[PDB]
Every structure is written in structure tokens, then in C-alpha cells.
Amino acid sequence: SGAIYVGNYRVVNRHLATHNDWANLVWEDSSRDLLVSSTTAQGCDTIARCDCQTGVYYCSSRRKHYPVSFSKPSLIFVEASEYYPARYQSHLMLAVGHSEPGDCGGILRCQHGVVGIVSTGGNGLVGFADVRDLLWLDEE
Numbered sequence: 001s002g003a004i005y006v007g008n009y010r011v012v013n014r015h016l017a018t019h020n021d022w023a024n025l026v027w028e029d030s031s032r033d034l035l036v037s038s039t040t041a042q043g044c045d046t047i048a049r050c051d052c053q054t055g056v057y058y059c060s061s062r063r064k065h066y067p068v069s070f071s072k073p074s075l076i077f078v079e080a081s082e083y084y085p086a087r088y089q090s091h092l093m094l095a096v097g098h099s100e101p102g103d104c105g106g107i108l109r110c111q112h113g114v115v116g117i118v119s120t121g122g123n124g125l126v127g128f129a130d131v132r133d134l135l136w137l138d139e140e
């Protein structure tokens, strides 16, 4: 589990969104596994606006933050899980790191701020849903 809290937005994995998230929906995209809802309080996270390929992510199944090198956001085939059939997921970055399903939501960050959240993984791989192209998260 986990979310990004920027401005009056809460960014979560679409497959982990609650009824309150769907009832206060701003935007959602199943192909990216992302959903954004509105918040009453302002958050403290800042979004990275960059092309970094190195950063650090949080792994809840290890209580640890790991430094990783990660690929550029791309369209990648992801195997079936409890939440999606086997399919192509867009805007996804891969790194070598430990992941388990409840690890989704952990933040990946670089020197510029938050890059994205854990969304896929398995077999020593971890996938991140990128948020750096969602410029509207910085306003309104």
C-alpha cells in the first residue's frame, strides 16, 4: 500500500483505490494502473520533472529503501496478477529489486522528487508507474 500526496491530490495504484477515492475521483487510467483523487488537506510530496534513471524506492516487504537503476517509461508486457490479466501496461519502468503484491504504492524518488510508485514485479524485478509526465499534479 501507499500513495503520493501532492497539493490537493492523492495518487494511488488504481487496483488499490478505495470507495472514497472513486467517490472523489480526479483521473484514472487502467493501462497505467494509476488513479488520482482529491484531498481536503494539502500534501508534502513534490513531483520530479526530469529523465533520471537512478533513484531509491521503498520496499514494505523488507522495511527498506533500496537504490536502483530503472528503465525509461515504456509499454511492457506484465504477467497476470489478482488485479489484471496478462497485458501491456504503459508508462512502466523496470528495475532489479525485491517486490511482492502488497509492495504496490511504495515511492520511487530521485534527486528532483517523486518519480512514481511500485505497481508490478516478480522474479527479482520491480515495476514502477511513472508520474513525471502528469504536469497537472503541480497545479489547480
Ligand SMILES: CSc1ccccc1CC(=O)N1CCNC(=O)C1
Pocket: 078, 079, 080, 081, 082, 099, 100, 101, 102, 103, 104, 118, 119, 120, 121, 122, 123, 126, 127
Ligand atoms: C510488485 S507487484 C508483484 C510482485 C511480486 C509478485 C507479483 C506481483 C503482482 C503480480 O501478481 N504480478 C503478476 C506477474 N507480473 C507482475 O509484474 C505482477
Ligand SMILES: [Zn+2]
Pocket: 048, 049, 050, 051, 052, 110, 111, 112, 113
Ligand atoms: Zn530526477
